[PDB]
From a paper:
Tmm7211 is a bacterial FMO which is able to catalyze the conversion of DMS to DMSO. Tmm is a bacterial flavin-containing monooxygenase (FMO), which belongs to the class B flavoprotein monooxygenases. FAD and NADPH molecules are essential for the catalysis of Tmm7211. The catalytic cycle of Tmm7211 consists of a reductive half-reaction and an oxidative half-reaction, similar to other bacterial FMOs.
Next, we tried the soaking method and solved two crystal structures of Tmm7211 soaked with DMS for different soaking time. For briefness, the crystal structures of Tmm7211 soaked with DMS for 5 min and for 20 min were termed as Tmm7211-5-min and Tmm7211-20-min, respectively. The overall structures of Tmm7211 soaked with DMS are similar to that of Tmm7211, with the RMSD between Tmm7211 and Tmm7211-5-min of 0.1 Å, and the RMSD between Tmm7211 and Tmm7211-20-min of 0.2 Å. Despite the two structures of Tmm7211 soaked with DMS were solved, the explicit electron density of DMS in the structures could not be identified. For substrates with no ring structure, such as DMS and TMA, there may be no effective interactions to stabilize their conformations, which may be the reason why we could not find the DMS molecule in the structures of Tmm7211 soaked with DMS. By comparing the structures of Tmm7211, Tmm7211-5-min and Tmm7211-20-min, we noticed that with the extension of soaking time, the electron densities of the nicotinamide ring and the ribose ring of NADP+ become increasingly weaker, indicating that the nicotinamide ring and the ribose ring become flexible during soaking. Combined with previous studies that the indole and methimazole molecules located in the binding site of NADP+, this result suggests that DMS may also be bound in the position of the nicotinamide ring of NADP+, and that the entry of DMS may repel NADP+, leading to a conformational change of the nicotinamide ring and the ribose ring. Because the electron densities of the ribose ring in Tmm7211-5-min and Tmm7211-20-min are rather poor, we could not ascertain whether the ribose ring can form a hydrogen bond with Asp314 of Tmm7211, the equivalent residue to Asp317 of RnTmm.
Residue numbers in the entry:
A (entry chain B): 1 to 442
B (entry chain A): 1 to 444
The structure:
């Protein structure tokens, strides 16, 4: 009988819409659900958008993906337990597909029934307060430039945390005669063909943006790290150096003495958990980490058990972890799962946070998020999927990356849902310029 | 005894802080004033910021000015009546200085006294409602990431309207392999040296951005217009054509049949009046125009006479019009100027709006904004300044631009405050590659 708001129709919002759909299909009555989405269409980060900065309505652009982007982990690690790759595609396909292929898969799962009709597009949630046992939500109908309001019993926040960039300043940027941008702004690597590119950062964005520039003909790529290098086997014309000190004209100078001609600086410096549309008392405040506190089972706002956050953890797992979170959230909303006492909640959060703080390397992190996801899996009815196989896959993938960062996407993994073995793509990633769905689907 | 909030410490917010400072210096008691500014420092659009999009706190970047920017109208048309160029600089200087020079002038006026201490920097107003005769305002202390609240008797909105870009979509952008950006994003024109550039738009940004790209070495510049061309005398490597039809891979295709290989598309397509931090009932909704309705004397919100907007009109005049608006607003706050009846207010708004809709060319627009500003001038005590001279200067300047768009910045105008004649600069603008104040003010 309740009313539920969902903010965002990317993978997470769709996961929970899908979780509710399972119940509705079985004949169970479900709450009225309204999902708000500021983009024109569903899909979240998996939508390519040429736009950067803010849109025609003055709304910041949430899209961060670029042209000719390929998935960066094995698809077998992100398969939906309730909607297999074999089911969607009708055949085995390689393990590292281009963006549009995974976009098609994500949207395919939810596009058969009534889910899309529940979403309000070009609609931006702007204000949320909890009063008289209800979430009072203001939202902007962007197309009409009008503020609307509604009230809800439960609120699910699924707005991601890789859209609002963190952008640090370095000395000399005020006079640098070239482009300075964040990875959030990166759209087509052809922009930088023939250019000397500087990339700052040491995680997924720095890695892939650097490789993307090199693949699309950058004259040179120089990666600066603050703490430790990624240490991958970079191809000729790429190097990793310690700590940008300053830009001095067309020259980047690093603390280790390196001086490099620079045409463009791409800050691959991460993102903010940013929730301007939530009251302070409701607002998760955290850096990117595997287990932020104040979230029971990584989902329920400790302070308000009718506020549920999805996908706010840093990510090895993605799609099927979001699913496990969403099935859990659904069952909480439906009162199938009961909240334990405040003391038990606090104890459980501390247990996981304590483990998280002690993680020292990717193997331990993969193990950590495996156990986190498996525990969620066991408390609801999300279907069978082999998280132990996924655990092994992630570790194998990490090894591939150290062995050869240029060829890890040329590897085959097996489905943890169907056992199907992925073929090796007809074209090595380094030479794969045709990222079309047709070619991928041979 | 009242408490006054001002949003923004750009030229307009500084104008009203300065207007109040005049009274305080004379010995008059003035209200408590709090000015909120999202930037790290004062100056508004006159601050150069390498940042684009949004900042390290997730706050959209309000800066739109680029490297190599020079005054686009005669400085004599924007002189402060109460702080002359002669006073600030101690000598006559050319009429079209680079950004840093005019920034220095703006901040010079307000930097001698207690104004800076009234401003909270890296502070963003986020919510405003009017309740029980007060504006309840929430603002974000960005450095601490904390929401604070306060209440005020009057609210002055001076957040400009050239910060939040209007960015239209054209067919084929989703598959374009080059850069697509708005003029709001434009920073260093050297970025486009040796590139083919497309500029869309027909106003000041399109004009100046196209010129900067050419000046700093673009392989070509092609300007697309929707309605009519600017029609200026463009130099070699530049052309003006009708209406972008689509991007087809790298190729820009126009409705007049032109096809141009493109490396970058720069949308010089204007900006939004954007006030997400104001309640719907308080929010001005308008496109860029010389006289938006619902603003008595172009300043007082028709529906709430304690809400005052500055600088929201499209601009020939800038600084001294902002001043005349601010002096007016100050006097309204101080109860020196009384509001007329509702009917009188409505009639006066209709009178100006009706005149505004009938304007057909820049001469008429210049005359209109001259009369608007002169009427403001006459109802308060902003010092003597010759708006009739400014009227003539603007018309002369429009002529210079048609004559030769490359050399209008080389011309000389006289001060409407002191009469001083500007010397011709030591470097013609078309050759002036260095935009530093140091280089400008010093011997060649
Ligand atoms: C460049 C990049 C590449 C990546 N590549 C991979 C990959 O190869 N494999 C992988 O598994 N993962 C990848 N990811 C990770 C990504 O986080 C997940 O794949 C997934 O997109 C997370 O989904 P989400 O729903 O939680 O958030 P999102 O996909 O970001 O969805 C959030 C949605 O909320 C909307 N929203 C935000 N604020 C509001 C508001 N106020 N009102 C209404 N709507 C709002 C946004 O428009 C967006 O649609 C990548 C991430 C990035 C940034
Ligand atoms: C590219 C460009 C070139 C120009 N060149 C010229 C020129 O050569 N000559 C000329 O006369 N005019 C020029 N202008 C015109 C310009 O509008 C005026 O000179 C002047 O800057 C307007 O000042 P303002 O105070 O109204 O607004 P702004 O200068 O924009 O100041 C507004 C301030 O409000 C702040 N702000 C906004 N929102 C918030 C919030 N929510 N909370 C707190 N603070 C906020 C912003 O940070 C900014 O500091 C130019 C404009 C542009 C865009
Ligand atoms: N499909 C793909 O190929 C692809 C491509 C892009 C990104 N992604 C996704 O993007 C998401 C986020 O990855 P991310 O790399 O953007 O964020 P991230 O994992 O949070 O990493 C942020 C990086 O910024 C660095 N950093 C922080 N402050 C800095 C500073 N002041 N100067 C320089 N560096 C600074 C950090 O290292 P230090 O603190 O040591 O400096 C860190 O390496 C991931 O989910 C990933 O999957 C995937
Ligand atoms: N100091 C300097 O040299 C300098 C440099 C740049 C800017 N500025 C200042 O910046 C301020 C704003 O000027 P502006 O030119 O940015 O804004 P503007 O005056 O509002 O002009 C907006 C332009 O966008 C065009 N347009 C609108 N929709 C469009 C679409 N869908 N496609 C293509 N074009 C579209 C309009 O023409 P159509 O409607 O006919 O298409 C118009 O020419 C001015 O105050 C100016 O002084 C100064």
């Amino acid at each position: 009988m309740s009313k539920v708001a969902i903010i965002g129709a990317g993978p997470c919002g769709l996961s929970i819409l899908r979780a509710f759909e399972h119940l509705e299909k079985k004949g169970e009555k479900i709450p009225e659900i309204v999902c708000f989405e500021k983009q024109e269409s569903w899909g979240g980060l998996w939508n390519y958008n040429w736009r950067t900065g803010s849109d025609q309505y003055g709304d910041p652009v949430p899209n961060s993906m670029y042209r000719y982007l390929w998935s960066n982990g094995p698809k077998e690690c992100l398969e939906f337990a309730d909607y297999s790759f074999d089911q969607h595609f009708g055949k085995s396909i390689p393990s590292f597909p281009p963006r549009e292929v995974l976009q098609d898969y994500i949207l395919g799962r939810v596009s058969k029934g009534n889910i899309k009709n529940k979403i309000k597009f070009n609609t931006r949630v702007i204000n949320t307060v909890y009063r008289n046992d209800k979430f009072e939500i203001n939202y902007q109908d962007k197309v009409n430039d009008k503020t609307l309001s509604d009230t809800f019993d439960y609120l699910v926040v699924s707005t991601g945390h890789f859209s609002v960039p963190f952008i640090p300043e370095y000395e000399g940027m005020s006079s640098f005669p070239g482009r300075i941008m964040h990875s959030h702004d990166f759209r087509d690597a052809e922009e930088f063909r023939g250019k000397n590119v500087i990339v700052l950062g040491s995680s997924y964005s720095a890695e892939d943006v650097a490789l993307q520039c090199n693949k699309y003909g950058a004259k040179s790529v120089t990666i600066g790290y603050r703490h430790n290098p990624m240490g991958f086997k970079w191809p000729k014309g790429m190097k990793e150096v310690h700590y940008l000190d300053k830009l001095d004209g067309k020259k980047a100078i690093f603390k280790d003495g390196t001086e490099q001609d620079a045409d463009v600086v791409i800050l691959c410096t991460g993102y903010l958990h940013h929730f301007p549309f939530l009251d302070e008392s409701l607002k998760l405040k955290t850096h990117n980490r595997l287990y932020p506190p104040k979230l029971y089972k990584g989902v329920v706002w400790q302070d308000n058990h009718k506020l549920l956050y999805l996908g706010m953890q840093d990510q090895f797992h993605t799609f099927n972890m979001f699913d496990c979170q969403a099935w859990f959230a659904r069952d909480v909303i439906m009162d199938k799962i009961k909240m334990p006492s405040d003391d038990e909640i606090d104890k459980d959060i501390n247990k996981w946070v304590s483990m998280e703080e002690k993680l020292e390397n990717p193997d331990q992190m993969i193990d950590f998020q495996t156990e986190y996801t498996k525990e969620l899996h066991n408390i609801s009815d999300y279907p069978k999927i082999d998280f132990e196989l996924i655990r092994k896959h992630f570790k194998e993938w990490e090894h591939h990356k150290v062995e050869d960062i240029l060829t890890y996407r040329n590897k085959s993994f097996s489905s943890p849902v169907t056992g199907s073995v992925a073929p090796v793509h007809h074209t090595p990633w380094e030479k794969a310029m045709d990222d079309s769905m047709k070619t991928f689907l041979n």
